[PDB]
């Protein structure tokens, strides 16, 4: 997995 903004990546 997740970005610095807690998104799935």
């Amino acid at each position, epitope marked *: 997995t*997740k*970005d*610095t*903004n*807690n*998104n*799935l*990546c």
Partner: antibody
Amino acid sequence: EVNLQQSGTVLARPGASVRMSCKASGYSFTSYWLHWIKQRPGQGLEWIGGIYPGNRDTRYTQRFKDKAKLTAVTSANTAYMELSSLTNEDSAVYYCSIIYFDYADFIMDYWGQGTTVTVSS
Amino acid sequence: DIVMTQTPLSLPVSLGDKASISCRSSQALVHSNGNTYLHWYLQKPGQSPKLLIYKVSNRFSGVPDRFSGSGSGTDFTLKISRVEAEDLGVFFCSQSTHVPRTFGGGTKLEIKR
């Protein structure tokens, strides 16, 4: 559940370095990024950096790069921000924030109360 | 930083009336995972901002139905179908699909009576 308790008001003397905390609960402190934000009295919100408690990996914007040091105590679910070489501009209110929108039955957008700093001699 | 520009910056409304705030970004807000992370907060004076609508049109818990979110790519809109005294505050639009998470300048909704 989910609440960020931050440290109370701090008075600092120019050139000094404050240190504030934010205690999290209600979610897995080790699994997400925690953001630190500064709201100078003049409304506008600005992101400073974030930290992944789990592996202690950090992220900072170019500005706060030499003005902030993020740290976290996982056994204590507590993250710490430390502003160095204070000045007049460093006077604002700092929140710690947790966002997460990828699971429908578990949406998280919570903020601390804010740790108002006052830089004065 | 991806710039969030709101307008109008001050918003005079009578109670019962309707209002809209427009938010726009320097670059698209569609994340590689296909989601568009654009949200709207409402900061009361002295309190931390509070979420109203996440991912363009999703209303957070407890938020009245009076609030609606819409928008796409780079152009977004928040709407208050009916204005009440509670709505008093500054409304922000934010972006979390890119690093850094950024916010608009704000929009003070000023009541008329």
